[PDB]
What we know:
Radius of gyration: 19 Å
Distance between the termini: 11 Å
Shape: globular
Number of domains: 1
Amino acid sequence: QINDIVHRTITPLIEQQKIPGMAVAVIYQGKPYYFTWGYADIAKKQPVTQQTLFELGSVSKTFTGVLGGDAIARGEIKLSDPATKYWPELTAKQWNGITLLHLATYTAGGLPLQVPDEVKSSSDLLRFYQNWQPAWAPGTQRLYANSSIGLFGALAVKPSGLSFEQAMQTRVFQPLKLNHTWINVPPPEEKNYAWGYREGKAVHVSPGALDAEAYGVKSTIEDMARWVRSNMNPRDINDKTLQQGIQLAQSRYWQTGDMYQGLGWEMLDWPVNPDSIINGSGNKIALAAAAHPVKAITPPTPAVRASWVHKTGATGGFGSYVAFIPEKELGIVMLANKNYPNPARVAAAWQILNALQ
């Protein structure tokens, strides 16, 4: 049963990685199953519950990709639009030919993993992009980057007239009944906000430019189970543009190695080789490992049901992982208040979902 494989996998993982608190949801034949361990606050012995909020880190990129997909489905943007269409002050010559597709899929030509920590004002942000010099031509190399998809999210909402948070709330969170999912945790919900732990110290994510767009969502294990269900079976969503946007986020725009780049989501063909995904999540020590040549998929392949769809995410004090297999109606969410190595997350998720086929 589900309980046995979950306990048999997560209990050693928590011990090996010294994880202070953890929540897991397994989605199995259209129903969620929840598990919690440990503490949201170690000192106060406040337990992790199904209402504890965890920082999703870069799992937030799946929300940004879906929000962008919804804007496409609304007719507000196209991925073929130039980035300058929505930010005309981006007059620097290197931006000719860079599209929203490039920003969304990390293929603009070497935008850096992090926005520099010295970027504080909007003028600081404009100068950063104006001074950026691409290492490669657009649409040739994938370099995973907050400064890339973060800007995609910020520009994707410009035709709506809404802020990124208002757009995300009204167009994604509220239609899917994610009523305990936040970019900015409101004061009444702070009692539910777990502490993250980095080297035994309690921490929360630090402010940064494009934080909301790139890594800034906090959510419960229940809302994330609903998130996985909605992305696994979009045809069950009654909001047409949101259903379409969810589908567009699992389209395959680029191929590199064994994986395909969606909007936020990343996909591999199912059945998936576990070494392919465990190794693909490892630490990229060498510079060359950060850039991957991409093959254009034109037109993009519409969402393939026989896929392993997944995304890792971390902040200073949290580590999260989401994966699902639409063909098998199977998925998992793993939220922890410690940033522990990605390969450990993927291996545990693999063992659980493999046992449930």
